[PDB]
Write a protein that binds this ligand. Sequence first.
Ligand SMILES: [Cl-]
Ligand SMILES: [Cl-]
Ligand SMILES: [Cl-]
Ligand SMILES: [Cl-]
Ligand SMILES: [Cl-]
Ligand SMILES: [Cl-]
Ligand SMILES: [Cl-]
Ligand SMILES: [Cl-]
Ligand SMILES: [Cl-]
Ligand SMILES: [Cl-]
Ligand SMILES: [Cl-]
Ligand SMILES: [Cl-]
Ligand SMILES: [Cl-]
Ligand SMILES: [Cl-]
Ligand SMILES: [Cl-]
Ligand SMILES: [Cl-]
Ligand SMILES: [Cl-]
Ligand SMILES: [Cl-]
Ligand SMILES: [Cl-]
Ligand SMILES: [Cl-]
Ligand SMILES: [Cl-]
Ligand SMILES: [Cl-]
Ligand SMILES: [Cl-]
Ligand SMILES: [Cl-]
Ligand SMILES: [Mn+2]
Ligand SMILES: [Mn+2]
Ligand SMILES: [Mn+2]
Ligand SMILES: [Mn+2]
Ligand SMILES: [Mn+2]
Ligand SMILES: [Mn+2]
Ligand SMILES: [Mn+2]
Ligand SMILES: [Mn+2]
Ligand SMILES: [Mn+2]
Ligand SMILES: [Mn+2]
Ligand SMILES: [Mn+2]
Ligand SMILES: [Mn+2]
Ligand SMILES: [Mn+2]
Ligand SMILES: [Mn+2]
Ligand SMILES: [Mn+2]
Ligand SMILES: [Mn+2]
Ligand SMILES: [Mn+2]
Ligand SMILES: [Mn+2]
Ligand SMILES: [Mn+2]
Ligand SMILES: [Mn+2]
Ligand SMILES: [Mn+2]
Ligand SMILES: [Mn+2]
Ligand SMILES: [Mn+2]
Ligand SMILES: [Mn+2]
Ligand SMILES: [Mn+2]
Ligand SMILES: [Mn+2]
Ligand SMILES: [Mn+2]
Ligand code: NA
Ligand code: NA
Ligand code: NA
Ligand code: NA
Ligand code: NA
Ligand code: NA
Lengths: 175, 175, 175, 175, 175, 175
Amino acid sequence: SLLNVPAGKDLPEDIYVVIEIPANADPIKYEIDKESGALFVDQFMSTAMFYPCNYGYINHTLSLDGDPVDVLVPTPYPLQPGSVTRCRPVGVLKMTDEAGEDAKLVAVPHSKLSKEYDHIKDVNDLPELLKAQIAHFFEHYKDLEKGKWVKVEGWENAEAAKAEIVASFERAKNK
Amino acid sequence: SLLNVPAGKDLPEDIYVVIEIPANADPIKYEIDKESGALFVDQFMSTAMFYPCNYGYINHTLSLDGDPVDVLVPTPYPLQPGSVTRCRPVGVLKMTDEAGEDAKLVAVPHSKLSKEYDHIKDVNDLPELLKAQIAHFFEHYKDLEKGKWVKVEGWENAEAAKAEIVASFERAKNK
Amino acid sequence: SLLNVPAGKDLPEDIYVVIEIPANADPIKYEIDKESGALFVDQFMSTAMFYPCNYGYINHTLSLDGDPVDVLVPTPYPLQPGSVTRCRPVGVLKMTDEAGEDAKLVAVPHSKLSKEYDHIKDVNDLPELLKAQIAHFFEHYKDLEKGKWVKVEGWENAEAAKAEIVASFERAKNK
Amino acid sequence: SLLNVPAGKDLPEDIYVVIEIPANADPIKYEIDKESGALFVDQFMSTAMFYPCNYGYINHTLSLDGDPVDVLVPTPYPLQPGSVTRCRPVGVLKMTDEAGEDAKLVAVPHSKLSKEYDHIKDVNDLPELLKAQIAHFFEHYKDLEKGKWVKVEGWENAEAAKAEIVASFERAKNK
Amino acid sequence: SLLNVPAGKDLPEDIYVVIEIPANADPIKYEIDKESGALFVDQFMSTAMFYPCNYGYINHTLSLDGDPVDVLVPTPYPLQPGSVTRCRPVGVLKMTDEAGEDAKLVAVPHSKLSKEYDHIKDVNDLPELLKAQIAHFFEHYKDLEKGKWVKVEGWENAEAAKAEIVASFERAKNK
Amino acid sequence: SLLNVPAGKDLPEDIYVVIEIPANADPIKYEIDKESGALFVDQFMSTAMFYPCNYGYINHTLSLDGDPVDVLVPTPYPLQPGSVTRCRPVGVLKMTDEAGEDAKLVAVPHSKLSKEYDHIKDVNDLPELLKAQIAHFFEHYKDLEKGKWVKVEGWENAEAAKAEIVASFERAKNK
Ligand SMILES: [Cl-]
Ligand SMILES: [Cl-]
Ligand SMILES: [Cl-]
Ligand SMILES: [Cl-]
Ligand SMILES: [Cl-]
Ligand SMILES: [Cl-]
Ligand SMILES: [Cl-]
Ligand SMILES: [Cl-]
Ligand SMILES: [Cl-]
Ligand SMILES: [Cl-]
Ligand SMILES: [Cl-]
Ligand SMILES: [Cl-]
Ligand SMILES: [Cl-]
Ligand SMILES: [Cl-]
Ligand SMILES: [Cl-]
Ligand SMILES: [Cl-]
Ligand SMILES: [Cl-]
Ligand SMILES: [Cl-]
Ligand SMILES: [Cl-]
Ligand SMILES: [Cl-]
Ligand SMILES: [Cl-]
Ligand SMILES: [Cl-]
Ligand SMILES: [Cl-]
Ligand SMILES: [Cl-]
Ligand SMILES: [Mn+2]
Ligand SMILES: [Mn+2]
Ligand SMILES: [Mn+2]
Ligand SMILES: [Mn+2]
Ligand SMILES: [Mn+2]
Ligand SMILES: [Mn+2]
Ligand SMILES: [Mn+2]
Ligand SMILES: [Mn+2]
Ligand SMILES: [Mn+2]
Ligand SMILES: [Mn+2]
Ligand SMILES: [Mn+2]
Ligand SMILES: [Mn+2]
Ligand SMILES: [Mn+2]
Ligand SMILES: [Mn+2]
Ligand SMILES: [Mn+2]
Ligand SMILES: [Mn+2]
Ligand SMILES: [Mn+2]
Ligand SMILES: [Mn+2]
Ligand SMILES: [Mn+2]
Ligand SMILES: [Mn+2]
Ligand SMILES: [Mn+2]
Ligand SMILES: [Mn+2]
Ligand SMILES: [Mn+2]
Ligand SMILES: [Mn+2]
Ligand SMILES: [Mn+2]
Ligand SMILES: [Mn+2]
Ligand SMILES: [Mn+2]
Ligand code: NA
Ligand code: NA
Ligand code: NA
Ligand code: NA
Ligand code: NA
Ligand code: NA
């Protein structure tokens, strides 16, 4: 099941991302249940917003929010919920929400799957519009959810994203 | 796998619904296979009709038709096949088909997932148009399937739906 | 062409709404060109937001922003861009943007098209979640567009919406 | 505008069909307004049914129901509302509704647009399942609309469809 | 999980097909991972082409390309990735790609699921346009993928398809 | 109607593109009818290919193929058929088909509509994958249409695209 997918072929540069929410999708937040491996509805979002990229996580990791570290994966067409994509990290949006520190990695499809994102080497290669739209999304999607909130710290580079991947794999390994 | 999802956190008022068929979908009836847990095509529907809400079942239950008890779940946007939603029962359409007694529960997203349906407390709070459209769907979707048929008994309240949930959980527990 | 559609059969209670943007749509703002009658792209929206209802205008009206008065029309399924729907006003979100006073009417499908919205008589009959989501949308969709902004005044009733319709028809008639 | 499209290059064998409702679409009945040429919502359908093929009419015709003669056009992918397709009639479903005699032509894409339907020469070449699904749709889609109803007479051949086209063109020419 | 689905109720005439890629879908090639059973992205296709039918495989088989034997399944509406459909083989496109011999079976929905394809008894009953479109797809979809290629041998009949099914089941049984 | 839209606010650098075919769409080629202004089906495509960008033309121009000059417009989300987008030319694919010389301009959304494509100044700024996919599409989409064919000459720069725009406007002005 999805519970058995590796974190990656060669962390932190070569990772697998389990997708929970497609790009260009309806405003439903899904989460994989750690017990059954099934996709559960987590929230019907109350704002008229949508996840700006495909969204999911790296298996066998843990952020301080108590869930696997989160990943945004840009693709040319939306991915299937519950599918897995091999990717390469290029940057990270550092942020906190009500559940704890809650970084959002950005990882692009690995070169073996497509040449499209090979030119994206680091965070400055991502489009400025996309990065601004992502930060705005996280800043506002919980605006009508009482007791839920976000504080964005800012964008950091690929080396920072890789360090976040390492830290989150260690946290899961260790407790 | 989906075979391992609970019936609910606190039956009969707090249930999990495994979705087989999204709302606003093409006329393909899917069913979860009790052996593999995979979604199988059950029928390519022969009438130009669509399931009026998301449609699925409560795990670890059994109706007299030999399958888990059926649930319709209204949502603001269609759910993913094979996903699970926490819900609260509000009413039931009593009916029989060629395979046996075959009630259709209506359960709304739980308050933890959305406040949208909190105002729906009982069957009279569901829109009359929706209830009529649901009964009409079940009355007619098998009209071109020889040997398949439906007899609708009528709509009953949340207490009746909860009793149906209890009865169907007991039937599975007991044989 | 669309340029010739009436404001309504019997303003202000019985109106026609020309739709520019469907519900559940991609973040592209279209506007009907007053010269050709064709749908033009007005903006590729920069936030990850979507219009919360179908969106358009009443022909042969003018708001202080220099465009026909705006309307949000809730429907069970999204409408086609460039199509016209007969509706009945039920409320209005008073607001201003950088182009001028810019109220957003809410009008529901007329009883001749559906009985679904007959129960919505006035602004308090609209769902609270929908009204909050609409105000939040207008407050934020221009957050990444420099020099574009919104100030929301608040929700008002059906009588206020009808007065806005009358005022906007007079403004177009008179200049 | 659409009001100016010919009935056909060479009636009754070579016709143009103006599409109002796509195949595989949501349950919204649209109609072209004879005054403005714009697509208006005619009804939000109350049954959970969908038009089984693309649906529209032949311009410059009139059925006894007071509207242009109706056409169902099978295609490999749904057509755009308000678009026009060159077609060839292959059969007709004779029927009446509350507004008068109201035949439903079936016409396939002309050979110049595709070779796919060249093999469909007459009504017996249409799939039996499709013909049954079409009749069932018309029999039932108005089942929850008070005062609206259908009586189906039955399927007739291409020669009957051509005669219906001629008769309906004459009715419009003459009054 | 999907890893446990039978090859079929009664091979080679009565098979199960696990779907990886829907019909009418975006140009993303998915593959089920033999370890986890999860759907992985295999390639973001570089040509502007789409799989002409639903596409997947028969479990517990092996082609010379090292993967389960491939199947195209025509349906009236696209199937869900990861779903299973009971089918009947009607023909096969013999071909090789860079990974080895790589036949493409065509199997239609079994009569128990629909009567629609009962009339398709053998390869000559498939539409000529569909067969040509399928061969063209395989000939060209890898045209921009360096080192990936296809050589089509040609279409063969249902008996040939059944022999391919038997051979591929034996190959998996034996190594 | 669309027949009245300008070629552009300031040709050749500031143009309007009338869209016939959305990006990410089904394989139906539409064309605006020069008589009625309505969208007609031109072909049901026989290959399993899709237009790689939104596709349309500049009004009041003529290529040697006898139709207005063609334009591909990349956007973040597909455009509506029959809608108009203000754009800026960045390159051109020189090619011929059976009807005559038939260049394909590439023009991006104007800066007034979005900042997304401001960085695309010239043809080398377009992604190599996109340019290769476009050429491959035109090379192959007519492969199953007898008597229809394409010969691609190759990609040229923004200055070449502007010259093509000027030439095509003159051809329409002059005959
Ligand atoms: Cl691991
Ligand atoms: Cl978050
Ligand atoms: Cl890589
Ligand atoms: Cl930012
Ligand atoms: Cl349980
Ligand atoms: Cl049933
Ligand atoms: Cl609840
Ligand atoms: Cl009822
Ligand atoms: Cl008026
Ligand atoms: Cl606004
Ligand atoms: Cl009304
Ligand atoms: Cl509010
Ligand atoms: Cl005519
Ligand atoms: Cl009718
Ligand atoms: Cl023909
Ligand atoms: Cl029939
Ligand atoms: Cl087996
Ligand atoms: Cl292949
Ligand atoms: Cl069979
Ligand atoms: Cl062939
Ligand atoms: Cl001009
Ligand atoms: Cl061309
Ligand atoms: Cl520009
Ligand atoms: Cl190229
Ligand atoms: Mn959306
Ligand atoms: Mn969470
Ligand atoms: Mn997460
Ligand atoms: Mn969070
Ligand atoms: Mn998190
Ligand atoms: Mn549908
Ligand atoms: Mn069943
Ligand atoms: Mn069931
Ligand atoms: Mn049943
Ligand atoms: Mn049942
Ligand atoms: Mn404006
Ligand atoms: Mn407006
Ligand atoms: Mn405004
Ligand atoms: Mn306005
Ligand atoms: Mn009518
Ligand atoms: Mn009609
Ligand atoms: Mn009628
Ligand atoms: Mn009629
Ligand atoms: Mn492979
Ligand atoms: Mn395969
Ligand atoms: Mn292969
Ligand atoms: Mn293979
Ligand atoms: Mn597509
Ligand atoms: Mn042409
Ligand atoms: Mn053209
Ligand atoms: Mn051409
Ligand atoms: Mn051309
Ligand atoms: Na909040
Ligand atoms: Na039946
Ligand atoms: Na702004
Ligand atoms: Na009726
Ligand atoms: Na290749
Ligand atoms: Na050709």
